[PDB]
Amino acid sequence: MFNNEPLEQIDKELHDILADEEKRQRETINLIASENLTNGAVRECLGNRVSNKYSEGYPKKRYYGGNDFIDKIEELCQKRALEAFNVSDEEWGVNVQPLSGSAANVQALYALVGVKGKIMGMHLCSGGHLTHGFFDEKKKVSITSDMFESKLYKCNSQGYVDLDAVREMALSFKPKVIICGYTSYPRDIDYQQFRQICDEVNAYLFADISHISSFVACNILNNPFLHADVVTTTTHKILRGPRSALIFFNKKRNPGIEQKINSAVFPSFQGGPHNNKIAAVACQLKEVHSPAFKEYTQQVLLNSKALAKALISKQIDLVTNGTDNHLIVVDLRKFSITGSKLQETCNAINVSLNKNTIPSDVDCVSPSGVRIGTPAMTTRGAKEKDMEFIADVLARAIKITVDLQEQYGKKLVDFKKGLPGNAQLQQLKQEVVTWAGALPFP
Amino acid sequence: MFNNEPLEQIDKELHDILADEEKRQRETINLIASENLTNGAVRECLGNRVSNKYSEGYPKKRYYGGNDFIDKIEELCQKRALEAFNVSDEEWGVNVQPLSGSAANVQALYALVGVKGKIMGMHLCSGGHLTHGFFDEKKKVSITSDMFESKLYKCNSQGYVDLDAVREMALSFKPKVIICGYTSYPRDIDYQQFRQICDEVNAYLFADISHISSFVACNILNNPFLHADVVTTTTHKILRGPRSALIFFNKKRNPGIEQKINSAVFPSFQGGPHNNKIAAVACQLKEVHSPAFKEYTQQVLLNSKALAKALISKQIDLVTNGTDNHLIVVDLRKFSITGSKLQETCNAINVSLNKNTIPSDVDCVSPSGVRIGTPAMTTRGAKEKDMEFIADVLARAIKITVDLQEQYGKKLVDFKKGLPGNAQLQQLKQEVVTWAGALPFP
Ligand SMILES: Cc1[nH]nc2c1[C@]1(C(C#N)=C(N)O2)c2cc(N3CCC(CC(=O)O)CC3)cc(F)c2CC1(C)C
Ligand SMILES: Cc1[nH]nc2c1[C@]1(C(C#N)=C(N)O2)c2cc(N3CCC(CC(=O)O)CC3)cc(F)c2CC1(C)C
Ligand SMILES: Cc1ncc(COP(=O)(O)O)c(CNCC(=O)O)c1O
Ligand SMILES: Cc1ncc(COP(=O)(O)O)c(CNCC(=O)O)c1O
Ligand SMILES: [Cl-]
């Protein structure tokens, strides 16, 4: 009693929007630092009938039966996660059930501290994620500021984590958890100095490496596994897997954390795991460990470095004046334009990036920068020499944004009126589509 | 810089297990009441590259750009959902971002009541879900019992919701929310009487129709939309969509609930939506609204009715002595066996079902029943005449379980030793595999 007609036949409306989405992805210079492109195998997993199975619980301790093949999949994903990050299954455990990064963090935080528990994270404007306790004066924006008591440490004016500030805050606030690893931080992290501060105040060290996971696995950036109690990461960014998350916990430093984290994921928070996600993660984790993937990750940093260099050579200011990782934040103050304006300009030429706060920014509406990243285009074959072109297109968008603000005004409503039909933009879009459309596309 | 080799080539280890899972699904009488089989279309969506896009926020109010085709998918999904449950976009809104049922419930409850907020739901042992505030003496098992102040109302000895008890509890506890719609409740619900209790104490009416959604959409069972403030449902059970969830909210009854629910899903709880889920949901929701899908849903009930009947005629007791829906809970006390034992027996003959508490059960370990449901086999083409066969097999399993308990003992450890190699089970497995293996399989 089912219709087995293909997607194109059964739902033509939806199939066209998705064909379009596909065409837009193919013809874009994607610099969203948090995005990547999945290969066909990861998408086969995601489309696999294994998502039919309810398998609440954990492997060999399942509530239901018929989970023999599911257990094999889940255990393989756990094995390969521990492998990929070069930790021993005797010292480290991992939970592969969190449905996405925000869930993984709320779950992992609750395991450690509980309701009304105290946590410290980096402020949103400085590079922290919403799930690191974000709130504003007007409201508790994140559940992690409401279901927990949260405190937020800022970076200095130059855009670096100020560890003096982190200690001053940890001693007076006395949190049970200190979170590090970030959404828009362009530099590496001193986990040892975090570990040192946590040890002092008897807090857990929590490292969210979602943005830089590949660097950590491939031994290119600092390893928080040598110091952290918990490591969280999404699997869909630089790691290039499906949309899912992994919670890692150090058993030796905190015995009985396994039970706390596993029970927090289920049954505290989630219900049935999504086994298609688990399959897809397991698949990408095989690839993560190959020496080929280390090469891709190396190319990511080589590209980021060269993009940063080319932008500085065009008199564009970056926060921290560069990058240790896949990401760069442009400081646009010298050009007297917002990140929101540049974003719109860039979307009009099929350049995908996001607006982003800088240190001097008081508020998150009208931020003074954009964030760019190399994982997506590095996945599409672009190399160091190709970054001069991306730098050139971004320079041209900035210039056009300045001209348009002059002609149509500073109000965003007015500015946007300038965008459609603009001869130069139409021209620049053409240049972008021609270069992007011909690149390899998984 | 990617490997585009197919799944079978890139990851043979994993591809074999998934081949095995496929064959296990194919060769099973699936009576897990919460399970179903997705078609190829829905799985195409889940495999679609649309999961590459970060698209935090809501349509036309997105934080990032390049979400033109994503906006269309999300708005199509919301439209198709409102249609499917026969509600006007003027009166009702829906959020299509919740990643699964548990997440949708925590998010919706948070929107309505907030941290420390008061909620009432049905106890797990009576048919309630974990996310309806479940706790026991030892611990607060669900986050819903910890981040909220929860109280639990029970069914009477015959297994029915006792509204007298729901009233008495509501007037002394005075919750902000009362939850109805359940995980193992085999009868329909008097939402009106819930609405009149809620109104009396000024609580919201929350209906979680995950198990019975298709019945609600096709007008076969009571419609909580006529009375409820919030309706939650998973999309993966009787509705036969992907793993995801929908939050419906009545704007007329509660102006400003829209913003409350929308900000609860993001940015309070989740981050980037999973657009492959959203597409997949959109795809299934079109099918849901066809008259062919109403015929399927009717067949679910016709089969459930026939299965109930056939089990009664073999002297097997059902909680409430029957069913108004897709599910039956067998009371096994007369045979002096546990649902835990029967489940293992059924798992050995490729019969998938789950252990389940009955009203007399004190504690959730060692429950005295099993739950069975018809949506999966109804999807696989089975009709009323086929239910006698399923009833025969389950009767034979109960018998075998009694005999094995006699021979090897009441302890589950010993009991399981009796399963492997058992000539009768092998015979019965064979009969199961032959009938199931040849049924239509999406
Ligand atoms: C969404 C999100 N989650 N975690 C994040 C973001 C970011 C961000 C920045 N900067 C950082 N550091 O991390 C972000 C956050 C926000 N806000 C502005 C304030 C808003 C509060 C409200 O009015 O409800 C909460 C979300 C806007 C952006 F454009 C961005 C870009 C982003 C995606 C990188
Ligand atoms: C998992 C889950 N979530 N929501 C549910 C269940 C069910 C269940 C029942 N009955 C009901 N009504 O709804 C259920 C729940 C449980 N427990 C046993 C006790 C446990 C507490 C602890 O020791 O941590 C909480 C979950 C065991 C089962 F076999 C089942 C079957 C089920 C899947 C239908
Ligand atoms: C450090 C960090 N942690 C967790 C998450 C959460 O991932 P989910 O969206 O899968 O919940 C993000 C994504 N942040 C959004 C971005 O940079 O685009 C992140 O940057
Ligand atoms: C009423 C109800 N609500 C929510 C959920 C949660 O769905 P997720 O698993 O997608 O979180 C369930 C599933 N309960 C498990 C079962 O009936 O088998 C449910 O029965
Ligand atoms: Cl998915």
From TrEMBL, chains A, B:
The Serine hydroxymethyltransferase-like domain is annotated at: 7-393
Keyword annotations for this protein, in alphabetical order, are: Methyltransferase, Pyridoxal phosphate, Transferase
Please identify the protein, giving its name as recorded. Answer: glycine hydroxymethyltransferase
Needed cofactors, names only, are: pyridoxal 5'-phosphate
User: GO MF terms on file?
Assistant: glycine hydroxymethyltransferase activity; methyltransferase activity; pyridoxal phosphate binding
Q: What is its EC number?
A: 2.1.2.1
The pathway that the record names for this protein is: One-carbon metabolism; tetrahydrofolate interconversion
What species is given as this protein's source? Plasmodium vivax (malaria parasite P. vivax)
Where N6-(pyridoxal phosphate)lysine occurs, residue numbers?
A: 237
Cellular component aspect of the GO annotation? mitochondrion
Among PANTHER family, the record links this protein to: SERINE HYDROXYMETHYLTRANSFERASE, SERINE HYDROXYMETHYLTRANSFERASE 1
Family named by the database record:
Belongs to the SHMT family.
Q: Which InterPro entries match?
A: PyrdxlP-dep_Trfase, PyrdxlP-dep_Trfase_major, PyrdxlP-dep_Trfase_small, Ser_HO-MeTrfase, Ser_HO-MeTrfase-like, SHMT-like_dom
One annotated GO biological process = tetrahydrofolate interconversion
